[PDB]
Amino acid sequence: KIVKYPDPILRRRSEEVTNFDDNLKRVVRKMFDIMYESKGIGLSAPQVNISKRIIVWNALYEKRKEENERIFINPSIVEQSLVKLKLIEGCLSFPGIEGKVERPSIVSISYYDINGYKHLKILKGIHSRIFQHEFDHLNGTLFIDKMTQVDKKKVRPKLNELIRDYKATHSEEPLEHH
Question: For residues 116-175, which are near Co ion according to CB under 5 A?
Answer: none
Which range in 21-29, 53-61, 85-93, 124-132 contacts Co ion by CB under 5 A? Answer: 85-93
Task: Determine the 3-state secondary structure of 64 from DSSP.
Answer: coil
Active site residues: 134
Count of residues that interact with Co ion, criterion CB under 5 A: 1
Q: How far is the CB of 22 from Co ion (least distance, A)?
A: 27
Which range in 2-10, 16-24, 57-65, 86-94 contacts Co ion by CB under 5 A? Answer: 86-94
31 binds Co ion (CB under 5 A): no
Collect all residues with Cβ–Cβ distance below 8 Å to 114 and sequence separation of at least 6.
20, 24, 25, 28, 71, 73
For the chain, counts of helices (H) and of strands (E): 4, 7
Q: CA–CA separation, 85 vs 101, rounded Å?
A: 8
Q: How far is the CB of 178 from Co ion (least distance, A)?
A: 25
Nearest to 43 by CA among 7, 70, 13, 81: 70
- For Co ion, the binding residue among 31, 91, 123, 144 (CB under 5 A) is 91
Nearer to Co ion, 56 or 91 (CB): 91
Ranges assigned E (strand) in 83-176: 84-91, 94-104, 106-112, 118-124
Nearer to Co ion, 74 or 132 (CB): 132
Which range in 33-41, 64-72, 88-96, 101-109 contacts Co ion by CB under 5 A? Answer: 88-96
Q: How far is the CB of 116 from Co ion (least distance, A)?
A: 26
Q: How far is the CB of 167 from Co ion (least distance, A)?
A: 21
Looking at residue 87, its amino acid is L
Q: CA–CA separation, 4 vs 11, rounded Å?
A: 11
Residues that bind Co ion (CB under 5 A): 91
